[PDB]
Amino acid sequence: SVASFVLLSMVGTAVGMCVCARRRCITPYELTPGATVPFLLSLLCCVRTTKA
Amino acid sequence: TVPTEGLEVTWGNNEPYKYWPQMSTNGTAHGHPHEIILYYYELYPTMTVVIV
Amino acid sequence: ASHTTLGVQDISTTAMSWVQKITGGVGLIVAVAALILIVVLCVSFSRH
């Protein structure tokens, strides 16, 4: 049971790294004045990529 | 006509004759043409050519 | 001779090799053409 526990904490840390990665998708491109980065979003494609 | 489950015929006072079919004299063995389908009639006539 | 009973999934020397020949799909590579279509479409197709 604690092995299932530690594996689900490994999935929890996967969730934590993914949510930190989505927050560090957002912090370079909040909605910069330029509001157009194909060179960012055309390579990253993490989440909600469609805003230029 | 003998089916795949055999046949029984009796005549007179003598013993009932059983009979059983077989995997025929000619078919089409392992050959360079298509040469299975005649064989694939010998087992299973009227069916499994339907999945062909 | 019931002991030589036969099911369906049965083996010739050559039948399944001709199946292996006739499983030569092309739908994979035309799906690859559909993928190159959707990624050229990614010019303005980046959310759906």
Swiss-Prot record, chain A:
Sequence segments annotated as region (Transient transmembrane before p62-6K protein processing): 25-45
Disulfide bonds: 25-46
Region called Interaction with the capsid protein, residue ranges: 20-24
Membrane topology field: Single-pass type I membrane protein
Cellular location(s): Virion membrane; Host cell membrane
Signal peptide feature range: none
Lipidation positions, renumbered (S-palmitoyl cysteine): 25, 45-46
Post-translational modification remark: Palmitoylated via thioester bonds. These palmitoylations may induce disruption of the C-terminus transmembrane. This would result in the reorientation of E2 C-terminus from lumenal to cytoplasmic side. N-glycosylated.
Spans within the Cytoplasmic topological domain: 18-52
Transmembrane feature ranges: 1-17
Function recorded in the entry: Plays a role in viral attachment to target host cell, by binding to the cell receptor MXRA8. Synthesized as a p62 precursor which is processed by furin at the cell membrane just before virion budding, giving rise to E2-E1 heterodimer. The p62-E1 heterodimer is stable, whereas E2-E1 is unstable and dissociate at low pH. p62 is processed at the last step, presumably to avoid E1 fusion activation before its final export to cell surface.
Quaternary structure annotation from Swiss-Prot or TrEMBL: Interacts with spike glycoprotein E1. Processing of the precursor of protein E3/E2 into E2 and E3 results in a heterodimer of the spike glycoproteins E2 and E1. Spike at virion surface are constituted of a trimer of E2-E1 heterodimers. Interacts with 6K protein. Interacts with host MXRA8; this interaction mediates virus entry. The interaction involves 2 adjacent E2-E1 heterodimers.
UniProt name for this protein: Spike glycoprotein E2
Source species of the chain: Chikungunya virus (strain 37997)
Residues of the full protein shown: 697 to 748 of 1248
